[PDB]
Design a protein around this ligand. Structure first.
Ligand SMILES: CC(C)Cc1ccc([C@H](C)C(=O)O)cc1
Length: 139
């Protein structure tokens, strides 16, 4: 085994904490999340842990609502059970410097984008015409 080199994806790696959220309840409504789940999920201030090991990216969300973990290879679709218990087919790619996560279920689709902006990790969640912006800071 030799030490691998880095990647552009290293800008995402680390431990992040949610510091702001806008329009998340409206995004969740558009997604189809029920009232009680929306209320509890909207209160959560997760930590998000992003790591890379070879071609495998792991995104771990630790919260008081749910914990989730996904591991994947860019461009390669996988099964995901979301925090609100949708069973989706997901593909994550890069669009420039943006991690683009598309989730498909029940004939619906939503896109989550993660991008570095200054010292922040900005998350855009889009369902149809509804966008929510969530901002993480280094933990
Ligand atoms: C709560 C439900 C809609 C699933 C869910 C949970 C977290 C997030 C964003 C990506 C984040 O990690 O802050 C989007 C969607």
């Amino acid at each position: 085994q030799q030490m691998g080199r880095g990647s552009m994806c290293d800008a995402f790696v680390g431990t992040w904490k949610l510091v702001s959220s806008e329009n998340f309840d409206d995004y969740m409504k558009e997604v189809g999340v029920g009232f009680a789940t929306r209320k509890v999920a909207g209160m959560a201030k997760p930590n998000m842990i992003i790591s890379v090991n070879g071609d495998v990216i792991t995104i771990k969300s630790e919260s008081t609502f749910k914990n989730t973990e996904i591991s994947f290879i860019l461009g390669q679709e996988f099964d995901e059970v979301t925090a609100d218990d949708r069973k989706v087919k997901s593909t994550i790619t890069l669009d420039g410097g943006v991690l683009v996560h598309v989730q498909k279920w029940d004939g619906k689709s939503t896109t989550i984008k993660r991008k570095r902006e200054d010292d922040k990790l900005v998350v855009e969640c889009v369902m149809k015409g509804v966008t929510s912006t969530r901002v993480y800071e280094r933990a």
